[PDB]
């Protein structure tokens, strides 16, 4: 996250980091003890991906961390990189062993299709991750976060020569400086509602980072709420 702030331990206990070919290549959010929602483009075949929850400092030991293996990966059925790189950019990772829940490992809430949209329209959501902190420099030790404003759709279409689909929304500041970035992908866009945060988006892509006129593009979770709940059921 460019222009973020250091998260406190326990401040975003639904956040997870993903390890694969390199550590912390992507982020995620906890749906429940057995499932993690992330971005589909983070899934490269052949790669064993390890999920780590209860993480705050990516190179120290908090003794709040829980590490798990991903036994099953379900990218959205409409997602296909060869047609569009970031349309339907959402995926579920099933963990081998359930996470044990506590103040550091807590799920993100997911409303229905309607209330997820309503909550999106509140106009402001917290974005988080261990991705790059400068446009081209270095990845983050401490979990960064940023509260991004919803950008209007017409305004967003004007910003880009690329195709923003109805499965996407845009968030960020008109005059740059502060944004999500490379490595943050798959992390949550949440909306807080009277103390309770709700998943409203997935961090997905953007043209450069924190640059003026260029907004972050997030997966519109409301359009995938029914899917997430079908696939992540517990028994």
């Amino acid at each position: 996250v460019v222009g973020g702030e250091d998260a406190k331990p326990g401040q975003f206990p639904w956040q997870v980091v993903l390890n694969g070919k390199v550590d912390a290549f992507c982020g995620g959010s906890i749906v429940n003890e057995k499932w993690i929602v992330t971005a589909a483009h983070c899934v490269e075949t052949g790669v064993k991906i390890t999920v780590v929850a209860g993480e705050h400092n990516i190179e120290e030991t908090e003794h709040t961390e829980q590490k798990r293996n991903v036994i099953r990966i379900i990218p959205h059925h409409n997602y296909n990189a060869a047609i569009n790189k970031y349309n339907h950019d959402i995926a579920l990772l099933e963990l081998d062993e359930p996470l044990v829940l506590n103040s550091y490992v807590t799920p993100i809430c997911i409303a229905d299709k309607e209330y997820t949209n309503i909550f999106l329209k509140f106009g402001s959501g917290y974005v988080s991750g261990w991705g790059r902190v400068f446009h081209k420099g270095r990845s983050a030790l401490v979990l960064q976060y940023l509260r991004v404003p919803l950008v209007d759709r017409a305004t967003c279409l004007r910003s880009t020569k690329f195709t923003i689909y109805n499965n996407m929304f845009c968030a960020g500041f008109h005059e740059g400086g502060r944004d999500s970035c490379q490595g943050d992908s798959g992390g949550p866009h949440v909306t807080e509602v009277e103390g309770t945060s709700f998943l409203t988006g997935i961090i997905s892509w953007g043209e450069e980072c924190a640059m003026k006129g260029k907004y972050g593009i997030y997966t519109k979770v409301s359009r995938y709420v029914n899917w997430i709940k079908e696939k992540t059921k517990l028994t």
């Binding site: 206990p13 807590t106 809430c109 509602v193």
Partner: protein, 54 residues
Amino acid sequence: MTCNIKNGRCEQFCKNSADNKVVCSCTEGYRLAENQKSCEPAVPFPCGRVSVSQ
């Protein structure tokens, strides 16, 4: 009183009843407080809450 104004004063979710009233409700992990408006934890670690006192 309807869900039109201030979400029926429902902290999380509101649905119009037929008696011209509001039934409020919560997400999973939460129960309607005796308030009939707020949503209080019904499980040890419910979703979307910071419980490490800041």
